Short mmCIF file of C-alpha atoms and ligand atoms in Angstrom, two decimals:
data_model
loop_
_atom_site.label_atom_id
_atom_site.label_comp_id
_atom_site.label_asym_id
_atom_site.label_seq_id
_atom_site.Cartn_x
_atom_site.Cartn_y
_atom_site.Cartn_z
CA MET A 1 19.93 3.85 21.54
CA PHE A 2 17.13 1.90 19.76
CA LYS A 3 18.06 -0.09 16.68
CA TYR A 4 15.62 -0.26 13.79
CA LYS A 5 14.93 -2.89 11.18
CA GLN A 6 12.45 -4.20 8.66
CA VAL A 7 11.90 -7.92 8.18
CA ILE A 8 10.35 -9.23 4.99
CA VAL A 9 8.74 -12.65 5.20
CA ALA A 10 8.69 -14.38 1.82
CA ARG A 11 6.74 -17.50 0.91
CA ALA A 12 9.09 -20.26 -0.22
CA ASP A 13 6.27 -22.62 -1.20
CA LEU A 14 5.11 -20.70 -4.28
CA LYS A 15 7.87 -22.01 -6.56
CA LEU A 16 8.61 -18.43 -7.66
CA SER A 17 11.69 -17.66 -9.73
CA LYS A 18 14.37 -15.64 -7.92
CA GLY A 19 13.76 -12.43 -9.86
CA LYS A 20 10.06 -12.53 -9.05
CA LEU A 21 10.63 -13.35 -5.38
CA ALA A 22 13.09 -10.46 -5.10
CA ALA A 23 10.51 -8.17 -6.72
CA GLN A 24 7.87 -9.30 -4.21
CA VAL A 25 10.26 -8.68 -1.32
CA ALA A 26 10.82 -5.19 -2.75
CA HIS A 27 7.05 -4.56 -2.97
CA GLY A 28 6.85 -5.40 0.72
CA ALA A 29 9.79 -3.23 1.70
CA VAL A 30 8.56 -0.20 -0.24
CA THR A 31 4.96 -0.51 0.92
CA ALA A 32 5.78 -1.01 4.60
CA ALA A 33 8.39 1.77 4.44
CA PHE A 34 5.69 4.18 3.31
CA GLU A 35 3.34 2.83 5.98
CA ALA A 36 5.97 3.74 8.57
CA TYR A 37 6.65 7.08 6.89
CA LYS A 38 2.99 8.09 7.23
CA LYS A 39 2.07 6.65 10.58
CA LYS A 40 5.43 6.10 12.44
CA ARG A 41 7.53 8.88 10.93
CA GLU A 42 10.15 8.81 13.70
CA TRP A 43 10.75 5.09 13.25
CA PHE A 44 11.02 5.52 9.49
CA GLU A 45 13.50 8.41 9.68
CA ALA A 46 15.84 6.67 12.12
CA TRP A 47 15.79 3.46 10.09
CA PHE A 48 16.27 5.21 6.76
CA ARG A 49 19.47 6.95 7.73
CA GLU A 50 20.87 4.11 9.88
CA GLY A 51 21.28 1.67 7.00
CA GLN A 52 17.58 0.84 6.54
CA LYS A 53 18.35 -2.68 7.72
CA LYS A 54 16.32 -5.43 6.08
CA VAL A 55 16.38 -9.16 6.73
CA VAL A 56 14.60 -11.69 4.54
CA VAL A 57 13.00 -14.69 6.21
CA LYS A 58 10.58 -17.28 4.90
CA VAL A 59 7.46 -19.31 5.60
CA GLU A 60 5.97 -22.28 3.76
CA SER A 61 2.30 -21.31 3.49
CA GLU A 62 -0.08 -18.45 2.86
CA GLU A 63 -1.72 -19.10 6.23
CA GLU A 64 1.42 -18.20 8.17
CA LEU A 65 1.59 -14.79 6.49
CA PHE A 66 -1.93 -13.99 7.68
CA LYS A 67 -1.18 -15.08 11.22
CA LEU A 68 2.01 -13.00 11.27
CA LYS A 69 0.19 -9.96 9.89
CA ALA A 70 -2.37 -10.25 12.69
CA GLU A 71 0.44 -10.34 15.25
CA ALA A 72 2.11 -7.30 13.70
CA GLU A 73 -1.22 -5.44 13.79
CA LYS A 74 -1.75 -6.35 17.44
CA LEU A 75 1.68 -4.90 18.31
CA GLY A 76 1.07 -1.71 16.34
CA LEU A 77 3.83 -2.37 13.82
CA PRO A 78 3.89 -0.84 10.33
CA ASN A 79 3.38 -3.71 7.90
CA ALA A 80 2.38 -4.62 4.37
CA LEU A 81 0.84 -7.87 3.13
CA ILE A 82 1.59 -8.11 -0.58
CA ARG A 83 -0.36 -9.46 -3.53
CA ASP A 84 0.65 -8.63 -7.10
CA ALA A 85 -1.88 -8.46 -9.94
CA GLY A 86 0.99 -8.77 -12.40
CA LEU A 87 2.25 -12.04 -10.91
CA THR A 88 0.01 -14.27 -13.02
CA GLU A 89 2.04 -17.46 -12.52
CA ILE A 90 0.11 -17.89 -9.26
CA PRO A 91 -3.65 -17.49 -8.60
CA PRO A 92 -5.12 -13.96 -8.53
CA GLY A 93 -5.01 -12.38 -5.08
CA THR A 94 -2.40 -14.80 -3.72
CA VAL A 95 -0.29 -13.17 -1.03
CA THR A 96 3.47 -13.46 -1.54
CA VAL A 97 5.24 -11.60 1.27
CA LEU A 98 4.63 -9.75 4.52
CA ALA A 99 6.93 -6.87 5.41
CA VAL A 100 7.11 -5.90 9.09
CA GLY A 101 8.72 -2.62 10.08
CA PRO A 102 10.66 -0.40 10.10
CA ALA A 103 10.34 -0.42 13.88
CA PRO A 104 12.53 -1.04 16.95
CA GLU A 105 14.30 -4.39 16.56
CA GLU A 106 13.00 -5.80 19.85
CA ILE A 107 9.38 -5.24 18.80
CA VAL A 108 9.86 -6.60 15.28
CA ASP A 109 11.57 -9.71 16.71
CA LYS A 110 8.46 -10.47 18.78
CA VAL A 111 6.79 -11.28 15.47
CA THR A 112 9.62 -12.50 13.25
CA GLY A 113 12.43 -13.55 15.60
CA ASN A 114 11.76 -17.27 15.29
CA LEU A 115 11.23 -17.34 11.52
CA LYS A 116 13.90 -19.03 9.49
CA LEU A 117 16.23 -17.20 7.14
CA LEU A 118 15.64 -17.49 3.41
CA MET B 1 -1.90 6.51 -20.75
CA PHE B 2 1.74 6.27 -19.55
CA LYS B 3 2.83 3.09 -17.83
CA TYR B 4 5.25 3.28 -14.93
CA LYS B 5 7.89 0.91 -13.64
CA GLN B 6 11.01 0.56 -11.55
CA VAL B 7 13.87 -1.67 -12.64
CA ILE B 8 16.41 -2.90 -10.12
CA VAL B 9 19.76 -3.97 -11.52
CA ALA B 10 21.46 -6.51 -9.26
CA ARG B 11 25.07 -7.66 -9.47
CA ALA B 12 25.24 -11.40 -10.05
CA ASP B 13 29.03 -11.54 -9.73
CA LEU B 14 29.20 -10.90 -5.98
CA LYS B 15 28.34 -14.48 -4.98
CA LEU B 16 25.69 -13.14 -2.59
CA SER B 17 23.22 -15.50 -0.94
CA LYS B 18 19.62 -15.13 -2.12
CA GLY B 19 18.36 -13.53 1.09
CA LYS B 20 21.08 -10.89 0.95
CA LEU B 21 20.56 -10.19 -2.76
CA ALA B 22 16.81 -9.79 -2.17
CA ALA B 23 17.57 -7.38 0.68
CA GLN B 24 19.85 -5.34 -1.58
CA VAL B 25 17.18 -5.22 -4.28
CA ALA B 26 14.78 -3.96 -1.59
CA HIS B 27 17.25 -1.26 -0.50
CA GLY B 28 17.32 -0.07 -4.10
CA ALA B 29 13.56 -0.12 -4.52
CA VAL B 30 12.88 1.76 -1.29
CA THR B 31 15.60 4.34 -1.85
CA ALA B 32 14.68 5.10 -5.46
CA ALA B 33 10.98 5.14 -4.56
CA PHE B 34 11.66 7.91 -2.06
CA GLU B 35 13.84 9.70 -4.62
CA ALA B 36 10.85 9.72 -6.97
CA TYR B 37 8.50 10.71 -4.15
CA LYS B 38 10.55 13.82 -3.40
CA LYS B 39 11.60 14.93 -6.84
CA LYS B 40 9.11 13.25 -9.28
CA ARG B 41 6.01 13.03 -7.10
CA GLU B 42 3.62 12.52 -10.02
CA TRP B 43 5.61 9.56 -11.34
CA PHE B 44 5.76 8.04 -7.86
CA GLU B 45 2.02 8.40 -7.20
CA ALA B 46 0.96 6.85 -10.50
CA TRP B 47 3.38 3.95 -10.08
CA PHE B 48 2.46 3.32 -6.45
CA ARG B 49 -1.22 2.82 -7.10
CA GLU B 50 -0.83 1.05 -10.46
CA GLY B 51 0.90 -2.02 -9.03
CA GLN B 52 4.30 -0.39 -8.36
CA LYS B 53 5.75 -2.62 -11.06
CA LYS B 54 9.31 -3.80 -10.45
CA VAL B 55 11.53 -5.94 -12.65
CA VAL B 56 14.84 -7.37 -11.50
CA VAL B 57 17.67 -7.55 -14.00
CA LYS B 58 21.37 -8.23 -13.55
CA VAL B 59 24.89 -7.24 -14.53
CA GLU B 60 28.22 -8.99 -13.92
CA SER B 61 30.40 -6.15 -12.66
CA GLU B 62 30.48 -3.08 -10.47
CA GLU B 63 31.57 -1.00 -13.46
CA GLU B 64 28.30 -1.58 -15.31
CA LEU B 65 26.29 -0.24 -12.38
CA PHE B 66 28.23 3.03 -12.50
CA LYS B 67 27.77 3.39 -16.24
CA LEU B 68 24.03 2.70 -15.92
CA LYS B 69 23.70 5.21 -13.08
CA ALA B 70 25.34 7.86 -15.26
CA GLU B 71 22.86 7.12 -18.04
CA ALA B 72 19.92 7.34 -15.63
CA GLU B 73 21.23 10.68 -14.35
CA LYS B 74 21.60 12.02 -17.89
CA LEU B 75 17.95 11.13 -18.61
CA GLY B 76 16.71 12.71 -15.38
CA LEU B 77 15.47 9.44 -13.90
CA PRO B 78 15.04 8.88 -10.16
CA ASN B 79 17.65 6.32 -9.16
CA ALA B 80 19.58 4.85 -6.25
CA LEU B 81 23.01 3.22 -6.29
CA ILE B 82 23.22 0.98 -3.23
CA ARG B 83 26.05 0.09 -0.88
CA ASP B 84 25.36 -1.57 2.48
CA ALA B 85 27.62 -1.07 5.49
CA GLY B 86 26.07 -4.16 7.06
CA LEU B 87 26.96 -6.40 4.12
CA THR B 88 30.41 -7.32 5.40
CA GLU B 89 30.83 -10.43 3.24
CA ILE B 90 32.01 -8.07 0.49
CA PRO B 91 34.48 -5.14 0.71
CA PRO B 92 33.33 -1.92 2.41
CA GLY B 93 31.66 0.51 0.02
CA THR B 94 31.01 -2.11 -2.67
CA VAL B 95 27.93 -1.25 -4.71
CA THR B 96 25.37 -4.04 -5.01
CA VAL B 97 22.38 -2.77 -6.99
CA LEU B 98 21.12 0.20 -8.97
CA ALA B 99 17.41 0.97 -8.90
CA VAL B 100 16.04 3.06 -11.77
CA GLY B 101 12.57 4.56 -11.51
CA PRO B 102 9.69 4.75 -10.89
CA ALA B 103 9.31 6.57 -14.19
CA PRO B 104 7.54 6.11 -17.55
CA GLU B 105 8.41 2.68 -18.95
CA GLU B 106 9.74 4.02 -22.26
CA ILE B 107 12.28 6.23 -20.48
CA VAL B 108 13.38 3.53 -18.03
CA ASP B 109 13.83 1.08 -20.92
CA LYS B 110 16.31 3.46 -22.56
CA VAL B 111 18.64 2.58 -19.70
CA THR B 112 17.65 -0.96 -18.74
CA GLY B 113 15.81 -2.41 -21.74
CA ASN B 114 18.74 -4.50 -22.96
CA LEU B 115 19.81 -5.83 -19.56
CA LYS B 116 19.21 -9.49 -18.93
CA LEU B 117 16.69 -10.81 -16.46
CA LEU B 118 17.94 -12.23 -13.17
NA1 NA C 1 3.65 -10.81 -14.94
NA1 NA C 2 25.79 -8.25 7.98
#
């Protein structure tokens, strides 16, 4: 009776235009979805046919994305920290979003439950 | 020497909040990515390791998404027309975005090249 979800944490301090931010969120969702597909197949499958729920939250620094990624790693959650070579309006290698999940909602919330909604 | 990309067409007439629109764009990207993975594996693989380029464009009606989906189908392009049962702020079954690709840029552009950027 587990519910599954993916939470994408987007940086709101990069002054990115909406189309670019949406693209970054999509990079995170796709990348983490494939991470789950290959190493947590059951979680991926359940999520994918139960609405593939996604919630977009935000942070105001690059540092918070790294700390959240570390927490996701420590809990064994599929995740993807995104950088985009094509996003030249920000410095090369700058991370834009962190996608966490798909995974059981209660586990994902341990990492992202207190983040604020975009 | 083919370049690959995925274009996600989002409806800008639904008055959706940014977090929800980004989530819908992500649904499209993930769904179409898996469509390509299963029926155009080569296109998916190239795209996925070459930056998985995504561009977000918009339309102002549900009707345009259907016409674009038909065009994508006629050109044999992986695509995903999205509806979200959890998006209750709009009528049930309402389509929100159409993701086209990954596929060679020149083919994708035949469908989305004249759409305006979000
Ligand atoms: Na660019
Ligand atoms: Na909802």
